[PDB]
Design an enzyme around this catalytic site. Structure first.
Site, PDB file in Angstrom:
ATOM      1  N   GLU A 159     -26.423  -4.055 100.886  1.00 40.84           N
ATOM      2  CA  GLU A 159     -25.184  -3.795 100.164  1.00 40.84           C
ATOM      3  C   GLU A 159     -24.128  -4.873 100.403  1.00 40.84           C
ATOM      4  O   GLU A 159     -22.975  -4.715 100.004  1.00 40.84           O
ATOM      5  CB  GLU A 159     -24.613  -2.429 100.560  1.00 40.84           C
ATOM      6  CG  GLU A 159     -25.504  -1.251 100.226  1.00 40.84           C
ATOM      7  CD  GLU A 159     -24.879   0.067 100.628  1.00 40.84           C
ATOM      8  OE1 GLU A 159     -23.811   0.415 100.075  1.00 40.84           O
ATOM      9  OE2 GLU A 159     -25.450   0.750 101.504  1.00 40.84           O
ATOM     10  N   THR A 207     -26.740  -9.083  93.994  1.00 41.11           N
ATOM     11  CA  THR A 207     -25.733  -9.421  93.011  1.00 41.11           C
ATOM     12  C   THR A 207     -25.616 -10.939  92.883  1.00 41.11           C
ATOM     13  O   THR A 207     -25.405 -11.468  91.786  1.00 41.11           O
ATOM     14  CB  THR A 207     -24.399  -8.800  93.410  1.00 41.11           C
ATOM     15  OG1 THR A 207     -24.603  -7.410  93.720  1.00 41.11           O
ATOM     16  CG2 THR A 207     -23.396  -8.922  92.279  1.00 41.11           C
ATOM     17  N   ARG A 259     -26.825  -1.055  91.522  1.00 40.57           N
ATOM     18  CA  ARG A 259     -27.200  -0.943  92.925  1.00 40.57           C
ATOM     19  C   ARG A 259     -28.643  -0.441  93.029  1.00 40.57           C
ATOM     20  O   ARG A 259     -28.941   0.720  92.728  1.00 40.57           O
ATOM     21  CB  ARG A 259     -26.224   0.004  93.632  1.00 40.57           C
ATOM     22  CG  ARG A 259     -26.837   1.091  94.523  1.00 40.57           C
ATOM     23  CD  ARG A 259     -26.997   0.679  95.980  1.00 40.57           C
ATOM     24  NE  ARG A 259     -27.741  -0.568  96.121  1.00 40.57           N
ATOM     25  CZ  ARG A 259     -28.291  -0.985  97.260  1.00 40.57           C
ATOM     26  NH1 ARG A 259     -28.205  -0.240  98.356  1.00 40.57           N
ATOM     27  NH2 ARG A 259     -28.943  -2.140  97.300  1.00 40.57           N
ATOM     28  N   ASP A 305     -34.267 -13.501  98.156  1.00 41.52           N
ATOM     29  CA  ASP A 305     -33.533 -12.331  98.599  1.00 41.52           C
ATOM     30  C   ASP A 305     -34.580 -11.501  99.329  1.00 41.52           C
ATOM     31  O   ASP A 305     -35.591 -11.133  98.744  1.00 41.52           O
ATOM     32  CB  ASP A 305     -32.954 -11.580  97.383  1.00 41.52           C
ATOM     33  CG  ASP A 305     -32.183 -10.326  97.775  1.00 41.52           C
ATOM     34  OD1 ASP A 305     -31.766 -10.217  98.949  1.00 41.52           O
ATOM     35  OD2 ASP A 305     -31.985  -9.451  96.908  1.00 41.52           O
ATOM     36  N   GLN A 318     -38.101  -3.330 105.187  1.00 45.22           N
ATOM     37  CA  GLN A 318     -37.583  -2.710 106.404  1.00 45.22           C
ATOM     38  C   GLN A 318     -36.990  -3.719 107.381  1.00 45.22           C
ATOM     39  O   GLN A 318     -37.161  -4.924 107.222  1.00 45.22           O
ATOM     40  CB  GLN A 318     -38.695  -1.920 107.090  1.00 45.22           C
ATOM     41  CG  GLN A 318     -39.430  -0.991 106.143  1.00 45.22           C
ATOM     42  CD  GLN A 318     -38.529   0.072 105.545  1.00 45.22           C
ATOM     43  OE1 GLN A 318     -38.860   0.677 104.526  1.00 45.22           O
ATOM     44  NE2 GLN A 318     -37.390   0.313 106.182  1.00 45.22           N
TER      45      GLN A 318
HETATM   46  N1  LIG Z   1     -16.637  -4.602  93.890  1.00 43.12           N
HETATM   47  C1  LIG Z   1     -17.607  -5.415  94.299  1.00 43.12           C
HETATM   48  N2  LIG Z   1     -18.876  -4.983  94.314  1.00 43.12           N
HETATM   49  C2  LIG Z   1     -19.885  -5.774  94.713  1.00 43.12           C
HETATM   50  C3  LIG Z   1     -19.647  -7.076  95.131  1.00 43.12           C
HETATM   51  N3  LIG Z   1     -20.819  -7.607  95.463  1.00 43.12           N
HETATM   52  C4  LIG Z   1     -21.756  -6.683  95.264  1.00 43.12           C
HETATM   53  N4  LIG Z   1     -21.193  -5.563  94.815  1.00 43.12           N
HETATM   54  C5  LIG Z   1     -21.888  -4.281  94.548  1.00 43.12           C
HETATM   55  O1  LIG Z   1     -22.221  -3.638  95.792  1.00 43.12           O
HETATM   56  C6  LIG Z   1     -23.507  -3.008  95.645  1.00 43.12           C
HETATM   57  C7  LIG Z   1     -24.534  -3.734  96.516  1.00 43.12           C
HETATM   58  O2  LIG Z   1     -24.786  -5.065  96.056  1.00 43.12           O
HETATM   59  P1  LIG Z   1     -26.227  -5.712  96.365  1.00 43.12           P
HETATM   60  O3  LIG Z   1     -26.292  -7.097  95.843  1.00 43.12           O
HETATM   61  O4  LIG Z   1     -27.281  -4.758  95.952  1.00 43.12           O
HETATM   62  O5  LIG Z   1     -26.205  -5.782  97.973  1.00 43.12           O
HETATM   63  P2  LIG Z   1     -27.541  -6.108  98.810  1.00 43.12           P
HETATM   64  O6  LIG Z   1     -28.245  -4.883  99.252  1.00 43.12           O
HETATM   65  O7  LIG Z   1     -27.068  -7.042 100.031  1.00 43.12           O
HETATM   66  O8  LIG Z   1     -28.440  -7.058  97.874  1.00 43.12           O
HETATM   67  C8  LIG Z   1     -23.889  -3.137  94.169  1.00 43.12           C
HETATM   68  O9  LIG Z   1     -23.301  -2.068  93.424  1.00 43.12           O
HETATM   69  C9  LIG Z   1     -23.222  -4.469  93.824  1.00 43.12           C
HETATM   70  O10 LIG Z   1     -22.985  -4.550  92.415  1.00 43.12           O
HETATM   71  C10 LIG Z   1     -18.343  -7.560  95.143  1.00 43.12           C
HETATM   72  O11 LIG Z   1     -18.098  -8.697  95.541  1.00 43.12           O
HETATM   73  N5  LIG Z   1     -17.306  -6.718  94.719  1.00 43.12           N
END
Ligand SMILES: Nc1nc2c(ncn2[C@@H]2O[C@H](COP(=O)(O)OP(=O)(O)O)[C@@H](O)[C@H]2O)c(=O)[nH]1
Ligand SMILES: Nc1nc2c(ncn2[C@@H]2O[C@H](COP(=O)(O)OP(=O)(O)O)[C@@H](O)[C@H]2O)c(=O)[nH]1
Lengths: 310, 312
Positions: free
Chosen positions: A11, A16, A146, A168, A172
Site C-alpha cells: 500500500e 500505482t 487497490r 514490482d 509473502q
Molecule cells: N491518495 C493517494 N493514494 C495513493 C497514492 N499512491 C497510491 N495510492 C493508492 O493507495 C492504494 C495502494 O497503492 P498500491 O500501489 O497498490 O500500493 P502497493 O501495495 O505498495 O503496490 C491504492 O488505492 C493506490 O491507488 C498517493 O500518492 N496518493
C-alpha cells in the site's frame, strides 16, 4: 536497458507507480483496458464502505439517520450476491445513503483507528458516476485501484533512449524478501513510503517501513544500486497532518504539525538510516503516486540520475 | 504451517505452464467470468492473426503456391490491413485455400501457435461482432508470461501457492520450501525453437535433466506432465518419432511413442533409487483432465511431502 525494482511495504504505492509508467511512457489505458477494472473499482468501493460500517460497531458509534440501520444489513446481503464486474443500483443506493450518513462519516474521519482503503473516499464520493451500468472507469479510477500484488510484476518501457525493465514484487514476506535477494545488483531501486502511515498504529507502520528501508539501503546486495526514495502519498499526508500530530509517530519530534516541516522530518528520519553517507547517496522525491503529472516530473529526475550514475 | 503447499511450474515455453495456471483458476476458484473472457477478445484475435500470417509468410520459404490464385490478393490485404468483418473474410478464404492448408500441414517446418487451427477453424464464431470468448478460447490463448505469476487456491484442505516464472533460469532457484515441481513437456514438439542445436524435445529433456537431478529440489516432489497429448495423439499418426529419436524402433502409435518419450525423460533421473517421478499424460486445455490429474497430484503431495498433519 535499466532494471528498476519497486520496493516498500504494501500500500506504499509500488503498483500505482507501475501504472503511471504505463500511462506516461507507452500509451496508457485504452477505454478498453479501463473497462477491465470495473470489477476492481466495485470491489474496492464495497470493501471501503463495509470496512467503515463494520468499524462503527467496534469503535462504538451509531448511524446518523437511525433508518440507515436497514441499509447497513442490506449492504452485506447485497455484497454476497454481488455479480463481480457489475453493481446494482439497489446496492448503489445502499452505499450512497450510508456514505451520506452522519455517524458513518464520523467513523470515516476516525479512519486511522482501523483499516480503510486510501481510495475509500475517492470512489464513494464519485459513486454516482461509478454506479452507472455503462460506466467506464477513468485512468484515475484505475490508478486509485487497490489490488494486492502477488508474484513479481514486470513492466517494460523506453524513456530517454533507455529501455526500462521495472519490477514490482508482491508475494509473502519471506519469499518476497528472498526474491529481492535474486535482485541483488539492480540498476535502481525505488523504495516507496506511504507518508500518511505516520498516525497509524499498525510497532508503528512508519517505523516498520523505516526498518525495511534501513535493510535495503545498507544492504551489501545494493552497494551499486541507486537507492531512490519515494516519500509517497504526500497529498493524504497534507490533509492529515493538519489534524494528526507527527508526534504520534515520532515522539522525539519538536517541530510543528505542518506539511513542510513534518514531511522534511520524515525524510530526515529515513535518510538518517543510511550508514554509508560518504559512499552512497539517497535520491528522494515527495510523491503523489496517483498524480500523473507529479510522477512524470519525478520519474524525469529519476531517469537523469540513473543516466549519470551509469 | 503444515497445510501450505508451494508449487513451481517448470518447462520449455509453449509447454502449457500458464494453461495449467488458468486451469487452477477455473477449477479451484471460479473460472473466467463472462466479463473476464471479454478481456481476451484481443489476444484471441492477435493469436489468430499471427497464426494465419505465420502460415502465408511461410508458403514462400517452402515454394508453395495458393490453390486458387485469387487468394494471392487476400494475401496482400492481410498484411497491409494488420477485427473487421473484412479481415474475417481474407482470413476465412486463405484458411480454406488448398495451398495454405498444405502449408499449414507442414507447420513442423516453421513456427506456428498450436491453437492455430483451433481458432481458424472457429473463425466464424470468433469474428462474430458480438464475440464473447469461451473459457476454452481463453485456455487456448497464447501470450508470453513475464515476471513471476502466482496463484493461490485451497483444495483438499490444502492451501496451494503455485508459481510460474517468466527467460526463466536463476529464478527457478529463487524459491524456498518448494513442495513440488510440475514440469511440463509439449509431447507434440517431437517433430520440431530455432533450428540451432537440438530440437525442442531434447531442449525440454536438458531442462528436465537439470531440474530432476538438482540437489536444491531433492526434497521436492517431481511431477512430470507429458502434456499436449491430444495434439500428440494426432501427430504420431502422420509424423515418425524418429524425427526426434532416430534410434527409435517402435511403432508410431500413441501408446508406444508416448511410453518411449516417458522413458527418455524418466531415464534422465540420475537418482532412480532415491527420487521418484510422478508422471501424468495431460491435456492442459482439457479442464476435466487437468482436475483429474491435479487431484492425483495432491494425493501424491499429501501422501509424500507433508507432515502427518491430518489430510492423510
Ligand atoms: N491518495 C493517494 N493514494 C495513493 C497514492 N499512491 C497510491 N495510492 C493508492 O493507495 C492504494 C495502494 O497503492 P498500491 O500501489 O497498490 O500500493 P502497493 O501495495 O505498495 O503496490 C491504492 O488505492 C493506490 O491507488 C498517493 O500518492 N496518493
Ligand atoms: N491443444 C492443446 N493446447 C495446449 C495444451 N497445453 C497448452 N496448449 C496451448 O499451447 C499454447 C502455449 O501454452 P502456454 O501455457 O502459454 O505454455 P507456456 O509458455 O509453458 O506457459 C497456448 O495456446 C495453450 O493454449 C494442450 O494440452 N493441448
Amino acid at each position: 536497458e535499466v532494471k528498476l525494482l519497486l520496493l516498500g511495504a504494501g500500500e506504499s504505492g509500488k503498483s500505482t507507480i507501475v501504472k503511471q509508467m504505463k500511462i506516461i511512457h507507452e500509451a496508457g489505458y485504452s477505454e478498453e483496458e479501463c473497462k477491465q477494472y470495473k470489477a476492481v473499482v466495485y470491489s474496492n468501493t464495497i470493501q471501503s464502505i463495509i470496512a467503515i460500517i463494520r468499524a462503527m460497531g467496534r469503535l462504538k458509534i451509531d448511524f446518523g439517520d437511525a433508518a440507515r440501520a436497514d441499509d447497513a444489513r442490506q449492504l452485506f446481503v447485497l455484497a454476497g450476491a454481488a455479480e463481480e464486474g457489475f453493481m446494482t443500483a439497489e446496492l448503489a443506493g445502499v452505499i450512497k445513503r450510508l456514505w451520506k450518513d452522519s455517524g458513518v462519516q464520523a467513523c470515516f474521519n476516525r479512519s486511522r483507528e482501523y483499516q480503510l482503503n486510501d481510495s475509500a473516499a475517492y470512489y464513494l464520493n464519485d459513486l454516482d458516476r461509478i454506479a452507472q451500468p455503462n460506466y467506464i472507469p477513468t485512468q484515475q479510477d484505475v490508478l486509485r485501484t487497490r489490488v494486492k500484488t502477488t508474484g513479481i510484476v514486470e513492466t517494460h518501457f523506453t524513456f530517454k533512449d533507455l529501455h526500462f525493465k521495472m519490477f514490482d514484487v508482491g508475494g509473502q514476506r519471506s519469499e518476497r524478501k528472498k526474491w529481492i535477494h535474486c535482485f541483488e545488483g539492480v540498476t535502481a531501486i525505488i523504495f516507496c513510503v506511504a507518508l500518511s502511515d505516520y498516525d497509524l498504529v499498525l510497532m508503528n507502520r512508519m517505523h516498520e517501513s523505516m526498518k525495511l528501508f534501513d535493510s535495503i539501503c545498507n544492504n551489501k546486495w545494493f552497494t551499486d544500486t541507486s537507492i531512490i526514495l519515494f516519500l509517497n502519498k504526500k497529498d493524504l499526508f497534507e490533509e492529515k497532518i493538519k489534524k494528526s500530530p507527527l508526534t504520534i509517530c515520532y515522539p522525539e519530534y519538536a517541530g510543528s504539525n505542518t506539511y513542510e516541516e513534518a514531511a522534511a522530518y520524515i525524510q530526515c528520519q529515513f535518510e538518517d538510516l543510511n550508514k554509508r553517507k560518504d559512499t552512497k547517496e539517497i535520491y528522494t522525491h515527495f510523491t503523489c503516486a496517483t498524480d500523473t503529472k507529479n510522477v512524470q516530473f519525478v520519474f524525469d529526475a529519476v531517469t537523469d540520475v540513473i543516466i549519470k550514475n551509469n
